[PDB]
Design a protein around this ligand. Structure first.
Ligand SMILES: O=C(O)c1cccc2c1Oc1c(C(=O)O)cccc1N2c1cccc(C(F)(F)F)c1
Lengths: 115, 114, 114, 115
């Protein structure tokens, strides 16, 4: 599991469950092509997005559908979604954990990179 | 204005208005003595807490009454309040801006020293 | 100033100066077309990006070139840039302030709509 | 494990290791009495601070010694430490995870509460 996503809810003090996540990889023509997708579990985590063999060097975009999350809770959020863009495995295979803390008008994202 | 406080509401996307703020300075006996206090304005800011002459080197604590803020909005918050403890260096001309972003179960605080 | 951008540096406790910011508006064909751009001032702010007449309802993207900022400081950052995508409602008098707090491997963004 | 602490480093993109944490409980005389303490592990976590039997209702303060952490890395931080104050178990036993994201001049803390 080289890529993991963790989403938390800052308003309810709980994991953000059933949040849709789409991952894209920048193609040779500067276009974003679908790479993987899924929904966060009851623990607010999403594992098994890819494998070490498939997760090659490149620029990846992790899109978290925050809008749908807040709408489902009856809250009108500011952002359409939260995006995290980064170059991965540029100096060898690494394990990436992308974390996001969500609020209606704000969000924070941090990355923990392991070797 | 050597010391300024700015509070924002992450749930409503607006300044946090009428939030009580208490500032304390560590005394010679490791005790926290009242230094200044006030409430944030409509812009979520609090200015005029002290002057350059009074704001001497020392350890200060800025306490933001976040609990009362959320209660007034009908939200049960996690924290009793938010505290920011820092040392004023006073090594050259310096203004301190303490900013806090509030959510019911989370808050972030940052300091901008210019 | 219907739209304002504020960027802070969480590592140095100062405004993030000379940070490139590009704003885009979603076109009729789901494409992002250039809308406005600039660089943050010494106060870490960027004003005068647009006017009320030009800032119509739509989906906008504010892209902050964080990578170049950290590289200039000799720090290898994680993100390529920071993006803020939002819908301008235009339901009554509204000013939008997009704030970003930057760290090498993390950033927070908040919107204050008044 | 009713009380857990997780600390991350926003500058290095890694867990904050060996960070001293002190927990206090408000006594009958408005005084803070020592409750438990420890240091974060290599995963930036601190478990086994207390047990369900000992963790009774009350106001607790979790103090994270952030200053020593940054000093050890050669960075002059702004805060003396990070404090998290909250009432616990007021409506029954709960599990609390206190998370902190650290930067030299900024920190964020969030709580995840489970039943
Ligand atoms: O493990 C836990 O029990 C755990 C409990 C609560 C929260 C987190 C937890 O794990 C992690 C891990 C990890 O476990 O390897 C790695 C990165 C982020 C998080 N994570 C997280 C998510 C969003 C924001 C923040 C932060 F803002 F507080 F930093 C931290």
């Amino acid at each position: 599991c080289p890529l993991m996503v963790k989403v938390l809810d800052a308003v309810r003090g709980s994991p953000a469950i059933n949040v849709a996540v789409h991952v894209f990889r920048k193609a040779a023509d500067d276009t974003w092509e679908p790479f993987a997708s899924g929904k966060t579990s009851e623990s607010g985590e999403l594992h098994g997005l890819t494998t070490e063999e498939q997760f090659v060097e490149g620029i990846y975009k992790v899109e978290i559908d925050t809008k749908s999350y807040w709408k489902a809770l009856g809250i009108s959020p500011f952002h359409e979604h939260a995006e995290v863009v980064f170059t991965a495995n540029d100096s060898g295979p690494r394990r990436y954990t992308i974390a996001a803390l969500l609020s209606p008008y704000s969000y924070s994202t941090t990355a923990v990179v392991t070797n």
